[PDB]
Amino acid sequence: MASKRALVILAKGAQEMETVIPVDVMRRAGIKVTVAGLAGKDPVQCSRDVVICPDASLEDAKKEGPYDVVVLPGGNLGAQNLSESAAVKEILKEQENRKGLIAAICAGPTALLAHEIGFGSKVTTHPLAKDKMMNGGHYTYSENRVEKDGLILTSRGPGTSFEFALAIVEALNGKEVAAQVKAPLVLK
Amino acid sequence: MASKRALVILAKGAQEMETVIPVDVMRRAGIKVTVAGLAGKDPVQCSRDVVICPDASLEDAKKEGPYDVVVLPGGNLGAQNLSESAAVKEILKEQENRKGLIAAICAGPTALLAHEIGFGSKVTTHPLAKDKMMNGGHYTYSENRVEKDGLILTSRGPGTSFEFALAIVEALNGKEVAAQVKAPLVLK
């Protein structure tokens, strides 16, 4: 059985917990994860100054698609950088067109708004990103910790990151793989 | 009021979630955190292949002590590397002698055993690290998600990392700072 593949797009100002937790949990599930630097291959300064080194540039990772999921971490500045990128636009439009999963957390869903992705969907965000996301009425808002409307999967914050990551694993690899990955984590 | 200071010792094979979550949460609390590379300043490959760039080498960070807390992430290989380091030994002995906090998660507490730190204390670990930690009977074991016996603070796994980090914040900066840092996280 071929391994599923995930693209995690890492921009300056990304929320580092929301980057690392999904990467780690997806890799535990046997997903081949590419941490792709929006800016290139150089290390990325996250929202609380953790510095993460990409596996590859987004420019190169874009050429090795398609991916079973495209993951957008949060962080206000990270999400703004994702929102400004034409490369990200192209990747997300292609992913929607091919009926592939898109997963975004905290402020990350606001890049879906910027790139006109998933309009009409029910979404959640961090509470502090609600009004940016809802500007223009292009979505329906949800309070759920993880929200999934077809292939638009959204979540709220650092404290929903494990739930978000496990939801991605379940969507890709099924319930039993997600449950097996969950138990050694010592979640409550 | 002078900012409290934390030393997070980052070794090859460290559990990346257990590194990032405490760093991020402590920084949210206004703690000045130094992510110190055991090996030097070069990027560190974690247990699930996330690569984190240290702020400084342990060699240099050791010279800018003392620190209000020394934090030991888990990961089997990370903890083994911490356990083999004479520099880590010296830092932990100094921290115990000065009545400073030591915080270790998952397999991280097994470096306390290696360095003869805190013998007699009640500790927890990841379940899979229990028998390494208990070899020789130098500690008393606990099932609590976070365990604190004086200035020996231990915890169990990725899924206890927020609890662990908030316990460190509470110990350093008090209950109200920890509660203020907690709410925007969207923990359950």
Short mmCIF file of C-alpha atoms in Angstrom, two decimals:
data_model
loop_
_atom_site.label_atom_id
_atom_site.label_comp_id
_atom_site.label_asym_id
_atom_site.label_seq_id
_atom_site.Cartn_x
_atom_site.Cartn_y
_atom_site.Cartn_z
CA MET A 1 0.00 0.00 0.00
CA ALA A 2 1.58 3.31 -1.13
CA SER A 3 2.17 5.81 1.67
CA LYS A 4 -0.02 8.84 1.71
CA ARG A 5 1.72 12.19 1.31
CA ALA A 6 1.27 15.51 3.07
CA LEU A 7 2.52 19.00 2.16
CA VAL A 8 2.94 21.33 5.17
CA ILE A 9 3.56 24.90 3.99
CA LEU A 10 5.87 26.73 6.41
CA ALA A 11 6.02 30.54 6.30
CA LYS A 12 7.71 33.15 8.48
CA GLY A 13 5.53 33.76 11.51
CA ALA A 14 3.89 30.32 11.45
CA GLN A 15 2.61 28.98 14.75
CA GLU A 16 5.32 26.49 15.64
CA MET A 17 3.14 24.18 17.74
CA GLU A 18 0.59 24.01 14.90
CA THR A 19 3.44 23.14 12.52
CA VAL A 20 5.23 20.54 14.59
CA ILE A 21 2.32 18.66 16.13
CA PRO A 22 0.70 17.79 12.75
CA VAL A 23 4.03 16.93 11.14
CA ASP A 24 5.01 14.60 14.00
CA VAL A 25 1.59 12.94 14.34
CA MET A 26 1.26 12.44 10.58
CA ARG A 27 4.75 10.88 10.43
CA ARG A 28 3.81 8.55 13.29
CA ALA A 29 0.93 7.41 11.07
CA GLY A 30 3.26 6.52 8.20
CA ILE A 31 2.39 9.57 6.10
CA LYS A 32 5.31 10.97 4.10
CA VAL A 33 5.34 14.60 5.13
CA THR A 34 7.19 17.36 3.29
CA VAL A 35 7.75 20.50 5.36
CA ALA A 36 8.03 23.03 2.52
CA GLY A 37 9.43 26.49 3.05
CA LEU A 38 7.35 29.18 1.40
CA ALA A 39 10.42 31.38 1.06
CA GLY A 40 12.81 28.61 0.04
CA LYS A 41 14.92 26.06 1.86
CA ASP A 42 16.28 28.40 4.54
CA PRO A 43 15.31 28.12 8.23
CA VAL A 44 12.02 29.73 9.20
CA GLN A 45 11.45 31.96 12.25
CA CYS A 46 8.09 31.05 13.77
CA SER A 47 5.69 33.17 15.82
CA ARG A 48 7.42 32.50 19.16
CA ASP A 49 10.93 32.50 17.68
CA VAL A 50 11.35 28.75 17.29
CA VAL A 51 13.37 28.20 14.10
CA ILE A 52 12.38 25.22 11.95
CA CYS A 53 14.38 24.03 8.95
CA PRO A 54 12.25 23.05 5.92
CA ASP A 55 12.75 19.72 4.21
CA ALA A 56 12.61 21.53 0.85
CA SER A 57 11.49 24.82 -0.72
CA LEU A 58 7.81 25.24 -1.74
CA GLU A 59 9.11 25.87 -5.24
CA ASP A 60 10.57 22.38 -5.38
CA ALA A 61 7.84 20.64 -3.35
CA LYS A 62 5.18 22.05 -5.68
CA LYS A 63 6.78 19.95 -8.46
CA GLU A 64 6.48 16.66 -6.53
CA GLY A 65 2.75 16.72 -6.06
CA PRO A 66 0.03 15.81 -5.88
CA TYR A 67 -0.38 15.42 -2.17
CA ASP A 68 -3.15 13.69 -0.24
CA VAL A 69 -3.37 16.68 2.11
CA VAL A 70 -2.14 20.27 2.07
CA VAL A 71 -1.73 21.64 5.61
CA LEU A 72 -1.77 25.33 6.54
CA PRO A 73 -0.56 26.14 10.07
CA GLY A 74 -1.73 29.26 11.82
CA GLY A 75 0.03 32.27 13.32
CA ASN A 76 -1.11 35.71 12.19
CA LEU A 77 2.01 36.54 10.23
CA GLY A 78 2.35 32.99 8.87
CA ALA A 79 -1.21 33.05 7.60
CA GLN A 80 -0.72 36.50 6.08
CA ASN A 81 2.34 35.23 4.22
CA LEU A 82 0.42 32.19 3.01
CA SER A 83 -2.41 34.49 1.91
CA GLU A 84 -0.08 36.66 -0.18
CA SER A 85 1.50 33.78 -2.11
CA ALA A 86 0.54 32.99 -5.69
CA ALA A 87 2.25 29.63 -5.32
CA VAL A 88 -0.04 28.78 -2.41
CA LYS A 89 -3.05 29.95 -4.46
CA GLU A 90 -2.14 27.55 -7.27
CA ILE A 91 -1.53 24.63 -4.95
CA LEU A 92 -4.83 25.08 -3.10
CA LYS A 93 -6.87 25.52 -6.30
CA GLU A 94 -5.32 22.37 -7.73
CA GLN A 95 -6.01 20.49 -4.50
CA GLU A 96 -9.68 21.56 -4.53
CA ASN A 97 -10.05 20.70 -8.16
CA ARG A 98 -8.66 17.19 -7.64
CA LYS A 99 -10.82 16.42 -4.63
CA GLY A 100 -7.92 16.43 -2.25
CA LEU A 101 -7.98 17.32 1.46
CA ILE A 102 -7.06 20.82 2.65
CA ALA A 103 -6.43 21.24 6.38
CA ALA A 104 -5.98 24.64 8.06
CA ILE A 105 -5.71 25.64 11.74
CA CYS A 106 -6.09 28.85 13.88
CA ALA A 107 -5.46 31.83 11.50
CA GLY A 108 -4.55 29.39 8.71
CA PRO A 109 -8.10 29.24 7.32
CA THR A 110 -7.88 32.92 6.45
CA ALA A 111 -5.56 31.89 3.59
CA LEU A 112 -8.48 29.90 2.20
CA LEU A 113 -10.46 33.16 2.14
CA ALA A 114 -7.62 35.03 0.45
CA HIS A 115 -7.30 32.40 -2.26
CA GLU A 116 -11.07 31.90 -2.79
CA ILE A 117 -10.92 28.28 -1.63
CA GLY A 118 -13.92 26.35 -0.39
CA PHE A 119 -16.44 29.20 -0.48
CA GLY A 120 -19.72 28.11 1.04
CA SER A 121 -18.08 25.74 3.51
CA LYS A 122 -18.61 25.52 7.20
CA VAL A 123 -15.33 26.39 8.92
CA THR A 124 -13.81 27.15 12.29
CA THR A 125 -10.83 29.31 13.19
CA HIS A 126 -9.18 30.65 16.32
CA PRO A 127 -11.73 32.93 17.99
CA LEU A 128 -9.46 35.93 17.29
CA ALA A 129 -9.46 35.13 13.53
CA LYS A 130 -13.23 34.77 13.21
CA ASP A 131 -14.10 38.19 11.97
CA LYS A 132 -11.10 38.07 9.31
CA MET A 133 -12.48 34.73 8.09
CA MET A 134 -16.13 35.83 8.02
CA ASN A 135 -15.56 39.08 6.18
CA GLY A 136 -17.85 38.97 3.16
CA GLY A 137 -19.89 36.01 4.33
CA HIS A 138 -18.08 33.45 2.18
CA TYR A 139 -18.27 30.70 4.80
CA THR A 140 -20.45 29.50 7.69
CA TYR A 141 -18.84 29.59 11.12
CA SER A 142 -18.51 26.74 13.57
CA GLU A 143 -17.45 26.55 17.22
CA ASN A 144 -16.36 22.91 16.90
CA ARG A 145 -12.77 22.19 17.90
CA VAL A 146 -12.30 20.46 14.53
CA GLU A 147 -14.70 21.15 11.67
CA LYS A 148 -14.82 19.15 8.43
CA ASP A 149 -17.06 20.07 5.49
CA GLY A 150 -16.16 17.69 2.68
CA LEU A 151 -12.47 18.20 1.96
CA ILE A 152 -12.19 21.48 3.95
CA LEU A 153 -10.85 20.56 7.43
CA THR A 154 -10.35 23.38 9.91
CA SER A 155 -9.45 23.77 13.58
CA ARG A 156 -8.98 26.43 16.26
CA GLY A 157 -5.65 26.69 18.10
CA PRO A 158 -2.57 25.17 19.65
CA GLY A 159 -4.75 23.22 22.03
CA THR A 160 -6.75 21.66 19.19
CA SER A 161 -3.61 20.66 17.25
CA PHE A 162 -3.59 17.03 18.33
CA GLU A 163 -7.28 16.72 17.46
CA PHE A 164 -6.61 18.40 14.09
CA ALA A 165 -3.65 16.15 13.32
CA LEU A 166 -5.53 12.99 14.28
CA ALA A 167 -8.46 14.08 12.12
CA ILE A 168 -6.07 14.36 9.15
CA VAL A 169 -4.67 10.90 9.92
CA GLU A 170 -8.17 9.45 10.18
CA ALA A 171 -9.20 11.03 6.89
CA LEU A 172 -6.13 9.61 5.08
CA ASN A 173 -5.36 6.32 6.77
CA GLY A 174 -8.59 5.43 8.61
CA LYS A 175 -9.85 5.25 12.16
CA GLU A 176 -7.70 2.39 13.37
CA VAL A 177 -4.42 4.00 12.30
CA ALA A 178 -5.47 7.22 14.02
CA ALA A 179 -6.42 5.35 17.19
CA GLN A 180 -3.09 3.46 17.19
CA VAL A 181 -1.16 6.70 16.77
CA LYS A 182 -3.18 8.36 19.52
CA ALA A 183 -2.65 5.94 22.39
CA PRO A 184 1.10 6.40 22.97
CA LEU A 185 0.65 10.15 23.07
CA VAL A 186 -0.80 10.26 26.63
CA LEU A 187 -3.60 12.60 25.58
CA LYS A 188 -6.42 13.06 28.16
CA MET B 1 10.50 42.75 37.53
CA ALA B 2 13.36 40.80 35.86
CA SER B 3 12.23 38.14 33.41
CA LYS B 4 12.69 34.58 34.45
CA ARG B 5 15.00 32.48 32.30
CA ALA B 6 14.73 28.93 30.99
CA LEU B 7 17.36 26.63 29.46
CA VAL B 8 15.93 23.99 27.09
CA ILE B 9 18.60 21.43 26.20
CA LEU B 10 18.11 20.15 22.63
CA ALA B 11 19.82 16.91 21.58
CA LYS B 12 19.63 14.77 18.45
CA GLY B 13 16.57 12.55 18.72
CA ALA B 14 14.64 14.90 21.02
CA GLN B 15 10.87 14.69 20.91
CA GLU B 16 10.02 17.75 18.84
CA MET B 17 6.55 18.32 20.30
CA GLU B 18 8.00 18.16 23.82
CA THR B 19 10.63 20.71 22.77
CA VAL B 20 8.42 23.18 20.96
CA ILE B 21 5.35 23.22 23.18
CA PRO B 22 7.30 24.19 26.35
CA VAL B 23 9.44 26.74 24.52
CA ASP B 24 6.40 28.43 22.96
CA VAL B 25 4.26 28.39 26.12
CA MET B 26 7.11 29.66 28.29
CA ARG B 27 7.80 32.50 25.81
CA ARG B 28 4.10 33.41 25.86
CA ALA B 29 4.52 33.80 29.64
CA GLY B 30 7.37 36.28 29.24
CA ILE B 31 10.11 33.80 30.17
CA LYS B 32 13.37 34.30 28.28
CA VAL B 33 14.01 30.86 26.83
CA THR B 34 17.33 29.69 25.42
CA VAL B 35 17.07 26.64 23.16
CA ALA B 36 20.60 25.29 23.60
CA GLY B 37 22.05 22.71 21.27
CA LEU B 38 23.84 19.92 23.10
CA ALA B 39 26.09 19.36 20.09
CA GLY B 40 26.63 23.02 19.27
CA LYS B 41 24.76 25.65 17.30
CA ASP B 42 23.93 23.47 14.29
CA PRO B 43 20.36 22.36 13.45
CA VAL B 44 19.09 19.35 15.36
CA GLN B 45 17.23 16.37 13.83
CA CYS B 46 14.42 15.38 16.20
CA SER B 47 12.74 12.01 16.71
CA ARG B 48 10.24 12.45 13.86
CA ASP B 49 12.69 14.28 11.60
CA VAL B 50 11.62 17.83 12.39
CA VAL B 51 14.78 19.97 12.33
CA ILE B 52 15.03 22.72 14.93
CA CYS B 53 17.76 25.36 14.97
CA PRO B 54 19.18 26.12 18.44
CA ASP B 55 19.43 29.69 19.67
CA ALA B 56 22.96 28.92 20.90
CA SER B 57 25.26 25.98 21.73
CA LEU B 58 25.04 24.37 25.21
CA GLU B 59 28.70 25.26 25.58
CA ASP B 60 27.88 28.95 25.32
CA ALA B 61 24.51 28.82 27.13
CA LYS B 62 26.15 27.10 30.09
CA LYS B 63 28.18 30.31 30.60
CA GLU B 64 25.09 32.56 30.80
CA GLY B 65 23.45 30.85 33.71
CA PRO B 66 21.99 30.48 36.16
CA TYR B 67 18.55 29.69 34.87
CA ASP B 68 15.26 29.56 36.75
CA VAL B 69 14.43 26.24 35.06
CA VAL B 70 16.37 23.63 33.11
CA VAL B 71 14.08 21.68 30.75
CA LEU B 72 14.80 18.20 29.39
CA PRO B 73 12.57 17.07 26.50
CA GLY B 74 11.97 13.42 25.87
CA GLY B 75 12.55 11.12 22.90
CA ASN B 76 14.52 7.94 23.50
CA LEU B 77 17.59 9.01 21.57
CA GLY B 78 17.40 12.60 22.84
CA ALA B 79 17.27 11.41 26.42
CA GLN B 80 20.15 8.99 25.83
CA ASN B 81 22.24 11.84 24.44
CA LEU B 82 21.36 14.02 27.42
CA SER B 83 22.26 11.13 29.73
CA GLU B 84 25.72 10.74 28.18
CA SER B 85 26.71 14.41 28.49
CA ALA B 86 29.08 15.63 31.19
CA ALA B 87 27.97 19.17 30.45
CA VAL B 88 24.38 18.22 31.23
CA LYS B 89 25.56 16.49 34.43
CA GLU B 90 27.25 19.69 35.60
CA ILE B 91 24.30 21.89 34.75
CA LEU B 92 21.80 19.66 36.56
CA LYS B 93 23.98 19.26 39.67
CA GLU B 94 24.42 23.02 39.85
CA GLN B 95 20.68 23.55 39.40
CA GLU B 96 19.89 21.10 42.24
CA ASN B 97 22.48 22.64 44.48
CA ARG B 98 21.08 26.15 43.96
CA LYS B 99 17.47 25.15 44.58
CA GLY B 100 16.46 25.72 41.01
CA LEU B 101 13.67 23.96 39.09
CA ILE B 102 14.42 20.97 36.85
CA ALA B 103 11.65 19.90 34.47
CA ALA B 104 11.80 16.68 32.41
CA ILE B 105 9.19 14.96 30.20
CA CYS B 106 8.57 11.44 28.69
CA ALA B 107 12.03 9.72 28.51
CA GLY B 108 13.69 12.95 29.67
CA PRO B 109 13.59 11.98 33.36
CA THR B 110 15.92 9.08 32.63
CA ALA B 111 18.70 11.67 32.28
CA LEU B 112 18.05 12.57 35.91
CA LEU B 113 18.77 8.92 36.76
CA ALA B 114 21.94 8.90 34.67
CA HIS B 115 23.26 12.03 36.36
CA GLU B 116 22.20 11.04 39.92
CA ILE B 117 19.79 13.97 40.18
CA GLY B 118 16.92 14.10 42.64
CA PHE B 119 17.31 10.60 44.07
CA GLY B 120 14.45 9.81 46.41
CA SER B 121 11.95 11.91 44.48
CA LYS B 122 8.56 10.93 43.26
CA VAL B 123 8.59 11.07 39.45
CA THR B 124 6.58 10.16 36.40
CA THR B 125 7.73 9.27 32.90
CA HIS B 126 6.19 7.97 29.70
CA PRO B 127 4.86 4.49 30.47
CA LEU B 128 7.45 2.99 28.11
CA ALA B 129 10.30 4.66 30.07
CA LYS B 130 9.13 3.51 33.50
CA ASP B 131 11.30 0.48 33.94
CA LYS B 132 14.52 2.51 32.67
CA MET B 133 13.70 5.18 35.28
CA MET B 134 12.96 2.73 38.11
CA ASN B 135 16.05 0.60 37.64
CA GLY B 136 17.77 0.53 41.03
CA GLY B 137 14.87 1.98 42.96
CA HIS B 138 16.25 5.52 43.11
CA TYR B 139 12.84 7.16 42.75
CA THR B 140 9.16 6.57 43.55
CA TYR B 141 6.85 6.26 40.56
CA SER B 142 3.72 8.26 39.88
CA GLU B 143 0.92 7.91 37.32
CA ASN B 144 0.07 11.62 37.49
CA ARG B 145 0.15 13.47 34.18
CA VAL B 146 2.45 16.05 35.80
CA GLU B 147 4.33 15.19 39.00
CA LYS B 148 6.20 17.74 41.14
CA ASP B 149 8.30 16.77 44.16
CA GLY B 150 10.00 19.95 45.33
CA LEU B 151 12.07 21.21 42.42
CA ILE B 152 11.84 17.94 40.40
CA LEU B 153 8.98 18.40 37.88
CA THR B 154 8.21 15.50 35.57
CA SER B 155 5.58 14.57 32.99
CA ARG B 156 4.58 11.75 30.65
CA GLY B 157 4.27 12.41 26.90
CA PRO B 158 3.39 14.62 23.97
CA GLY B 159 -0.17 14.80 25.20
CA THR B 160 0.90 16.08 28.62
CA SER B 161 3.21 18.75 27.14
CA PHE B 162 0.80 21.65 27.56
CA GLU B 163 0.14 20.63 31.17
CA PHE B 164 3.92 20.30 31.74
CA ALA B 165 4.65 23.69 30.19
CA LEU B 166 1.89 25.43 32.14
CA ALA B 167 3.17 23.83 35.34
CA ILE B 168 6.60 25.34 34.65
CA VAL B 169 5.02 28.74 34.00
CA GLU B 170 3.00 28.49 37.21
CA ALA B 171 6.08 27.55 39.21
CA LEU B 172 8.07 30.52 37.84
CA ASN B 173 5.55 33.27 37.24
CA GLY B 174 2.52 32.24 39.34
CA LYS B 175 -0.97 30.96 38.79
CA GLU B 176 -2.45 34.03 37.15
CA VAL B 177 0.24 34.25 34.46
CA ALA B 178 -0.24 30.56 33.71
CA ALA B 179 -4.01 30.98 33.52
CA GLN B 180 -3.65 34.00 31.19
CA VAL B 181 -1.30 32.08 28.91
CA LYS B 182 -3.64 29.08 28.91
CA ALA B 183 -6.87 30.67 27.74
CA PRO B 184 -5.89 31.66 24.18
CA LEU B 185 -4.58 28.18 23.54
CA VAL B 186 -8.04 26.56 23.07
CA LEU B 187 -7.15 23.63 25.32
CA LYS B 188 -10.10 21.40 26.37
#
